[PDB]
Symmetry: D2
Subunit: 278 residues, 4 copies
Amino acid sequence: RASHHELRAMFRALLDSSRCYHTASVFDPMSARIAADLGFECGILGGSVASLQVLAAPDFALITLSEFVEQATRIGRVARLPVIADADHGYGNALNVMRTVVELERAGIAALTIEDTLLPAQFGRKSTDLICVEEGVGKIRAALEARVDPALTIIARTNAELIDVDAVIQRTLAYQEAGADGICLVGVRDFAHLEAIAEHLHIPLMLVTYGNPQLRDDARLARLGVRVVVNGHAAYFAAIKATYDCLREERGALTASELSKKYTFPEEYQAWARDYME
Amino acid sequence: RASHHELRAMFRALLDSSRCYHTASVFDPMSARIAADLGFECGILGGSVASLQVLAAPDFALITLSEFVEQATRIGRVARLPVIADADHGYGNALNVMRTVVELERAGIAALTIEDTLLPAQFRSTDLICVEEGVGKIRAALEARVDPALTIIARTNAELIDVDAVIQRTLAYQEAGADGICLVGVRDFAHLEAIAEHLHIPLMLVTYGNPQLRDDARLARLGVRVVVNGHAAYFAAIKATYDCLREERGAVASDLTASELSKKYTFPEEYQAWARDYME
Amino acid sequence: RASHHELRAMFRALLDSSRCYHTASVFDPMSARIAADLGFECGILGGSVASLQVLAAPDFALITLSEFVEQATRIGRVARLPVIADADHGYGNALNVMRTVVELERAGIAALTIEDTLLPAQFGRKSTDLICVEEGVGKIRAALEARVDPALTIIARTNAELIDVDAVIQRTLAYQEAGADGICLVGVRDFAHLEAIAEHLHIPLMLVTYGNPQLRDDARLARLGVRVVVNGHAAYFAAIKATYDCLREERGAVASDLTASELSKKYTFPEEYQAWARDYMEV
Amino acid sequence: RASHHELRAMFRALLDSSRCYHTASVFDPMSARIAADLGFECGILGGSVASLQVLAAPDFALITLSEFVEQATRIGRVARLPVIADADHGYGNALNVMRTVVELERAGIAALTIEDTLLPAQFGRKSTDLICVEEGVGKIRAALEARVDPALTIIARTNAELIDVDAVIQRTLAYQEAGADGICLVGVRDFAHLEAIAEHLHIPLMLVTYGNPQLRDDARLARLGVRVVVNGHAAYFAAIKATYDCLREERGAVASDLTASELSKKYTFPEEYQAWARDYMEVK
Ligand SMILES: O=C([O-])C(=O)[O-]
Ligand SMILES: O=C([O-])C(=O)[O-]
Ligand SMILES: O=C([O-])C(=O)[O-]
Ligand SMILES: O=C([O-])C(=O)[O-]
Ligand SMILES: [Mg+2]
Ligand SMILES: [Mg+2]
Ligand SMILES: [Mg+2]
Ligand SMILES: [Mg+2]
């Protein structure tokens, strides 16, 4: 019964509240139904999980925009809670970002992130790098132009592990001024790190913590402007382990995250990158 | 490194052997990779698991042929064991059948089954199309084939119709040139034995863990090469996802089995309500 | 600028005018942009043409719902005029009909037709018959239930050619009863025929005439309640002929004397599909 | 009748002959059926034409690999002549190239081109810049590794317009050494330009000429190793103009003055895409 637009209103309501919320990992229609049934307030479609499902591949931007959108569209037919799409770098330059936004808003997603990582991996650079802030600003501005339903939330994402706090403040302030509805940060260490970045932000914050034990004080998160916390996709690795255990028993022939990692053939992709990209 | 054609050769080799093999449930790339790691000889992409994956929907012919093919294509990019696709009734009449063969063969599947169930549910029951129509769908499938190593398997339902009629159909399909026969609903080694008698092509059983059919040396002797135990591996995954999120939430979780859980999130009463409302 | 919802308001606003409208054939992004630039009020995405573009195939329900929705989706990204999708039989029973509406409404189309033709062609029966009126009413009800944006127009279509006029009036009334926003008619012979049918409908009418000279009168049509007229897909066949003639001239080959419709039919390989239908679908 | 594999052998036999062949523009199943009926030896699916068909958009790498592949798949269900796919840069880095080859091969294409253009366009940087030759070699070697059917023809494409002859010579030799099956060249000026680049190649050449009148001589081209000429995608433009002409006369509008190509460009909304590039991809 909630439409794509109504789901966007619900998400905005979470953001205007004075609490933060932990996302359920929602990657397909079954998991979306599960999350809603357990009473989760919002979910997240991760780019990493889409890449496991479509391709059994590492999180290397191998999936195409169409493939990511098919995943989102399948979730959008059944989702009764608002779903955030991790939309990587927008699948190209700022013109590709427009299309990312059109496709995902139509798929029925409640909110999406665009991040300023230089993707896909560059020739010879075994470093993960960020695009210049000027490019990043144009991508956020491009995303906001492409939006049709103004209830859609556009979250600018950056990586605070890569760069120093003063560059994170600079970029995130620039994205706020560009019109971002929220700021998403990955790589934040602890509360001192967070307070330094949160100080000059007045739009809601989204945190990708991957179960960081030094960011478990939710009351403190919320009063620093954090509304959404993402801990990762254990629920997907648990499904992979279950499938394996069942088949292994049927046959008579590693943790869950190690098992999921193994089936991405990381060594094969690592050999290709060495042989063709360095 | 094995091509789509080589996997067809490997599957034919199993059918020519003296043994019968038990499929792994293979519904996506991760599962295809797990099945091969575990040493399975062949895999099976069931229409019902595609329906849960794409739609969280019951096994009601709701997925389009393109969706079903998308699932098969994703598998074909990684599969190192031959995989059988359950292709339902071939997604329409005999001319639609030719498209399903073309689509699934290109996606890289090793064998497919075409069943004579009248799908989708007619405005009735689980009926069967006439034997003449079924023969013509099989001849059409075999025509549509390009790679001759591709195995075309003709499927019928034995649970309902009397064994004469099953003997009747399956003989006609054998006559029409099918590479093998797929049987669902066989009761026991006696019932198998009857249908098996006048057949010289490989047999495939969808038993669903039927306890009365567990002798592999004996199924083989009778001409069975492939046994499909079901899709518990898929339910395990749903349960596991549910359990992890339920723990994360601090909610207090069901006492449903992996299968009752899977069925629940298929919303079967909505679909049952719509059928009663719009198709009665 | 105009959103999928605003296009639906425009289409509703046409159906509530006292005027008749002639569709442009809108089959892809470029044709949609052409048709808007020319001032057309609405377009139609025909299933026959989707089948030409996707498959080079006759109009035999060979294309999948997904393929058809992909065509609608492409159009939806550019369309500044409202577009009607010919959704054939809803790609299955009433359960499939519901998916058909969900998919096409999400694609962005302003209106869609569900017809009561028995599809795909069934075994033995060399003619193409209609589902019983009750399966028809169940289909139409399921379509309306599946709709989310109430501004989406759901149109019930039937064939006024084979079955006698009374059987027709019966079907249309039941559809109108069932809650259809409009009726679509194929194979109306003439105004005598139309008037019989128009008489006890009060919901907007749409006509697929195929150029029928007996129905050429717009003021009259509108007074009878017709709001949309589909003349066909000549603009697609013109594209086929232009591609043929350009390549023929680059090659240095002799001219063909087939017309644009003739060339388009030829490239569907109709004889091949016929041999298969005789070989595999007749006793 | 001809399988995807059989089509590749037919393509290879063109390459092995002593003649140059002119592609038909083949962008969907009806056009593939037309080209075959007319007796064309081979066809070409242009990425530019895919962008017009899927998006009504200019050739700006806006189409996804999945969209390109769907176009190529439609064609592959009916093609009776070998079709070359213009695969742009492989839709990302060398690892994306692998997937490009996988998808188009399975689609049933006879041959594909991978170009060393830096794509998509860079924030301010320059839309026609090339990647370094080392990255180009890695992309070519990745395509060749990704190939399953050995009959598939893999062509390394470069742009001779803006870089110097010695640089084209360097890149083409290195793609030849990397094992490319052919070399495709866009932006060749004339026979002297061509002769310099052709001189140290021994694999078949493909030329994208865009009607360049300084390169019209089949015998003379074939003697330099040219096997395939792509003259452009006029046949698509003609199909657009025909649709325009038909609806406009249906409407009662005045006849258009614009050529087929002018009218096709108009409906890509070039000014809109240009304004967006200005506003979002240039320093403020
Ligand atoms: O890709 C992911 O899973 C993410 O960034 O959350
Ligand atoms: O649908 C299924 O899962 C089957 O028949 O194996
Ligand atoms: O398919 C068509 O073109 C129609 O029914 O209008
Ligand atoms: O894109 C094109 O049309 C080409 O590169 O030939
Ligand atoms: Mg991610
Ligand atoms: Mg099944
Ligand atoms: Mg139609
Ligand atoms: Mg190109």
